[PDB]
Amino acid sequence: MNLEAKKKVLRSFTYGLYVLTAKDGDEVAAGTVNWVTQASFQPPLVAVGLKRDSHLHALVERTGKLALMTLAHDQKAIAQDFFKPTVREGDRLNGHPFEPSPTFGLPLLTELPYWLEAEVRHLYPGGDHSLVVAEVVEAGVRREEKPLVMWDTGWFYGG
Amino acid sequence: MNLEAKKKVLRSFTYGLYVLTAKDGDEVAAGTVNWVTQASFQPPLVAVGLKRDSHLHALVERTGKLALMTLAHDQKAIAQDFFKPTVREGDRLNGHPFEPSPTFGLPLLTELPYWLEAEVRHLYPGGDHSLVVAEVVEAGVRREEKPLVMWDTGWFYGG
Numbered sequence: 001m002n003l004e005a006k007k008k009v010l011r012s013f014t015y016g017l018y019v020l021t022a023k024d025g026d027e028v029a030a031g032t033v034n035w036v037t038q039a040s041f042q043p044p045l046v047a048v049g050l051k052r053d054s055h056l057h058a059l060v061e062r063t064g065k066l067a068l069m070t071l072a073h074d075q076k077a078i079a080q081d082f083f084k085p086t087v088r089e090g091d092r093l094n095g096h097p098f099e100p101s102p103t104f105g106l107p108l109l110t111e112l113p114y115w116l117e118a119e120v121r122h123l124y125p126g127g128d129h130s131l132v133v134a135e136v137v138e139a140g141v142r143r144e145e146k147p148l149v150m151w152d153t154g155w156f157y158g159g
Numbered sequence: 160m161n162l163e164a165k166k167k168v169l170r171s172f173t174y175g176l177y178v179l180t181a182k183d184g185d186e187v188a189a190g191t192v193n194w195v196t197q198a199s200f201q202p203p204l205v206a207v208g209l210k211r212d213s214h215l216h217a218l219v220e221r222t223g224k225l226a227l228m229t230l231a232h233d234q235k236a237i238a239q240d241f242f243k244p245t246v247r248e249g250d251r252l253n254g255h256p257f258e259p260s261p262t263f264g265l266p267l268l269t270e271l272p273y274w275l276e277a278e279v280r281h282l283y284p285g286g287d288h289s290l291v292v293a294e295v296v297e298a299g300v301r302r303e304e305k306p307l308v309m310w311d312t313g314w315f316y317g318g
């Protein structure tokens with residue numbers, strides 16, 4: 001196939017920026033992700049493309065539980081902080097305060113305006129990423145704000 | 160759960176705008192979609208949330224074939240034209256010229272800068288939408304342009 005064109009086409013896709021968290025006892029993982037879409041109104045499903053070779057994947061597949069937070073428009077610095085491995089500093093992950101989510105006790109970054117907790121319904125191991133489909137079981141809004149659009153950061157993850 | 164919050168959280172997600180096409184003989188369907196994400200680099204997978212109760216879904220599930228085009232930043236008018244049922248006017252669909260895609264003969268809207276053809280690898284019937292995962296088999300670029308970001312239209316499809 002035309003490989004240069006495939007890369008350019010996939011890089012024309014528009015994404016937001018989100019932090020996905022997971023945990024199992026003392027194992028905690030948090031990572032910035034873009035490959036996220038809603039996948040039904042009823043039930044309320046979210047789909048996430050999750051790198052197979054990652055701690056997040058290992059925890060999500062093992063526990064069937066995840067949390068996802070939307071980054072605000074002024075939070076590119078927070079997104080940057082979750083491209084590196086997750087270190088817990090008391091009640092912070094990579095410098096950012098968290099609280100346990102109400103159903104599953106997953107890390108919710110308090111600074112981020114929108115969050116959801118979700119139970120995995122399906123995992124399709126398609127390639128170097130699995131497509132994880134999860135049903136929203138609880139959510140919260142701290143304030144309404146414009147989210148961080150990947151275009152505005154100059155970053156890409158795709159192609 | 161907190162339903163008002165769930166709606167607001169899912170509506171904080173960022174999407175692009177794309178036209179998805181499908182066909183089986185004289186049956187042709189084209190629709191504007193937002194629930195689209197890449198789902199692996201290898202193989203090159205795209206995932207689409209496709210309304211179960213739609214002609215697009217019927218054709219995609221039946222033939223296992225789809226095409227997806229990215230709308231340019233100045234093409235909100237084109238996006239609007241594919242929220243209504245698809246009528247073929249010779250070599251146009253809803254006023255917009257198409258050509259057959261090279262592998263599968265699916266409608267490619269010539270005005271749109273980026274296109275891909277894909278073969279369905281997996282279909283998860285999760286709810287009112289199915290999550291269709293497809294591998295990119297051919298693609299093309301007509302020109303590099305900024306894509307249409309859903310935020311900039313004032314439209315929503317989510318919650």
Ligand SMILES: Cc1cc2nc3c(=O)[nH]c(=O)nc-3n(C[C@H](O)[C@H](O)[C@H](O)COP(=O)(O)OP(=O)(O)OC[C@H]3O[C@@H](n4cnc5c(N)ncnc54)[C@H](O)[C@@H]3O)c2cc1C
Pocket residue numbers: 028029030031032033034035036049050051053054055056058082083084085086129155156157
């Ligand atoms: C712009 C951008 C967008 C991105 N979008 C996505 C996206 O959409 N989806 C996605 O998945 N990634 C995406 N990534 C990468 C993502 O941010 C990282 O994979 C994520 O930060 C890793 O989280 P983690 O530190 O908990 O995982 P890890 O890479 O695993 O690092 C955490 C620690 O866990 C250990 N570890 C590694 N593998 C395992 C394992 N299998 N079992 C137990 N422990 C392990 C490591 O040694 C490390 O110390 C993106 C990156 C960028 C730059």
Ligand SMILES: Cc1cc2nc3c(=O)[nH]c(=O)nc-3n(C[C@H](O)[C@H](O)[C@H](O)COP(=O)(O)OP(=O)(O)OC[C@H]3O[C@@H](n4cnc5c(N)ncnc54)[C@H](O)[C@@H]3O)c2cc1C
Pocket residue numbers: 187188189190191192193194195208209210212213214215217241242243244245288314315316
């Ligand atoms: C902002 C926005 C975003 C959207 N995003 C998405 C998205 O992400 N994913 C998504 O799926 N939709 C999305 N939609 C809706 C999507 O644009 C329409 O479902 C699409 O335009 C329908 O295409 P169609 O006309 O070929 O399907 P149809 O609704 O089916 O209409 C085409 C014709 O086919 C007939 N038909 C209906 N059902 C069948 C059937 N099952 N078998 C055979 N024929 C049938 C109808 O009578 C009609 O004449 C979005 C809408 C908006 C407003």
Ligand SMILES: Cc1cc2nc3c(=O)[nH]c(=O)nc-3n(C[C@H](O)[C@H](O)[C@H](O)COP(=O)(O)O)c2cc1C
Pocket residue numbers: 007051128156157158159200201
């Ligand atoms: C920002 C970014 C962009 C990437 N783009 C591509 C790509 O275009 N094609 C591809 O095959 N892999 C791409 N990859 C994946 C890497 O080439 C490769 O799989 C590597 O293992 C990624 O490791 P890591 O993302 O866990 O750090 C990308 C990874 C990142 C971080």
Ligand SMILES: Cc1cc2nc3c(=O)[nH]c(=O)nc-3n(C[C@H](O)[C@H](O)[C@H](O)COP(=O)(O)O)c2cc1C
Pocket residue numbers: 041042166210287315316317318
């Ligand atoms: C723009 C748009 C937004 C929608 N938002 C919601 C939503 O918030 N919650 C929901 O349950 N359904 C939502 N729906 C789905 C409809 O309420 C309902 O399922 C209907 O059958 C949609 O028909 P149609 O999209 O095929 O025209 C939305 C549909 C559209 C067109």
